[PDB]
Amino acid sequence: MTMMSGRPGRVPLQFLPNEARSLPPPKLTDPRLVYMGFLGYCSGLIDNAIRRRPVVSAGLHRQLLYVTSFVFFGYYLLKRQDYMYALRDHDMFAYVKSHPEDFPEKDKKTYGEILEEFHPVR
């Protein structure tokens, strides 16, 4: 039930291994970063609304800090998520390569020589 916690050579609490540096970092105009900044902006607006302040105008420094914090955390979150997916595919490809008898390459037939049952609509 625990897939990748026991992966060999895994440091307990790094959050971002050294090998993850081999991957292209997310662009700063990444749509996911833009959505994280939007979440920070919404948090700032809700903070104004709860405190009974002018929602759009009250805390520009506070709203800016909300947006900046959300973007800053989202960058490293995206890096870690991309690294984990890269690890998943790396392990999958290595396992398929090391077990050819479990993933055989079978000759594929053309449609002119496969017999498919025809079901009339009437």
Binding site: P8, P12, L13
Partner: protein
């Protein structure tokens, strides 16, 4: 769930007491020291699923 702080820091908070074959005072051996030593050396590093078989 299990935040493995001990191995990250090399602290050894409670690992000295987990098994029977680990550094007893005055080198007093457990009743089944050899069997546990053999089983641990058999199962080391191959994973629980493979070790069960």
């Amino acid at each position: 769930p299990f935040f493995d702080v001990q191995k990250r820091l090399g602290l050894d908070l409670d690992r000295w007491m987990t098994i029977q074959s680990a550094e007893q005072p005055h080198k007093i051996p457990g009743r089944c020291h050899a069997f546990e030593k053999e089983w641990i050396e058999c199962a080391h590093g191959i994973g629980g699923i493979r070790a069960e078989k």
